[PDB]
């Protein structure tokens, strides 16, 4: 879909009013299935490792998040369609320049390709960026063609601050999701009983990310 209109007339107002925005049928069936094949190839060839946390304490990571992940830049062989997804994500964000709150978005993370391998795995309630690490927008693409959340679970439940309802996001095939990464949107991945895939990038606010980098580089 043309990025300019999608960004300015839907994503921007959705995000400013609600902090959450769902765009269904983002890339179409053919591209979505190609991304699925690339993700399944990453899985099959042993690329995924246990998802990690910002700060590590005495606890096992698997008591917090049960997924296995790899990071993708988009130019690797066999990841070209994931790269197209990332470019489309970036195109929307660039068309939102200066319209998403007061943020100045200048960069992002690599893509995290994540799998909850059924078996009841999930992610306890958490905030993506609680202490100012620079992340302002979480962007997730789901690619689960036959997912029936009523049986397989895996719903992303977001608890947007100040709202009278929470937001249940089924991990639907070809669904794109945006939400503010900060404390306004605590969220949990409810237990998954089938293999569940999602691809996330986090967009950085320039000033906050610069401060977080200064903190890291000074110890």
């Amino acid at each position: 879909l043309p990025a300019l209109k999608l960004a300015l007339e839907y994503i921007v107002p959705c995000m400013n009013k609600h902090g959450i925005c769902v765009v269904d049928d983002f890339l179409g069936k053919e591209t979505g299935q190609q991304i699925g094949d690339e993700v399944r190839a990453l899985h099959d060839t042993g690329k995924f490792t246990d998802g990690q946390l910002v700060s590590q304490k005495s606890d096992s990571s698997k008591d917090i998040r049960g997924d296995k992940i790899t990071w993708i830049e988009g130019k690797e062989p066999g990841c070209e369609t994931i790269g197209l997804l990332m470019s489309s994500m970036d195109d929307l964000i660039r068309h939102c320049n200066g319209k998403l709150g007061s943020y100045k978005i200048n960069g992002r993370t690599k893509a995290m390709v994540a799998c909850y391998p059924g078996n009841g795995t999930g992610y306890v309630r958490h905030v993506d960026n609680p202490n100012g690490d620079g992340r302002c927008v979480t962007c997730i693409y789901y690619l689960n063609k036959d997912w029936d959340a009523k049986v397989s679970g895996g719903i992303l439940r977001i608890f947007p601050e100040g709202k009278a309802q929470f937001a249940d996001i089924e991990p639907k095939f070809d669904r794109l999701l945006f939400f503010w990464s900060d404390r306004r949107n605590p969220h949990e991945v409810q237990p998954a009983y089938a293999t569940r895939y999602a691809i996330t990038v986090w967009y950085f606010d320039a000033d906050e990310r610069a401060r977080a980098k200064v903190k890291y580089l000074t110890g």
């Binding site: 998802g51 304490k57 964000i93 992610y123």
Partner: peptide, 20 residues
């Protein structure tokens, strides 16, 4: 209260980030 960073999904702080 709990340190919410112990629950937040890791991202690399080193290297660069992707520049748009």
């Amino acid at each position: 209260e709990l340190d919410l960073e112990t629950l937040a999904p890791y991202i690399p702080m080193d290297g660069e980030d992707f520049q748009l």
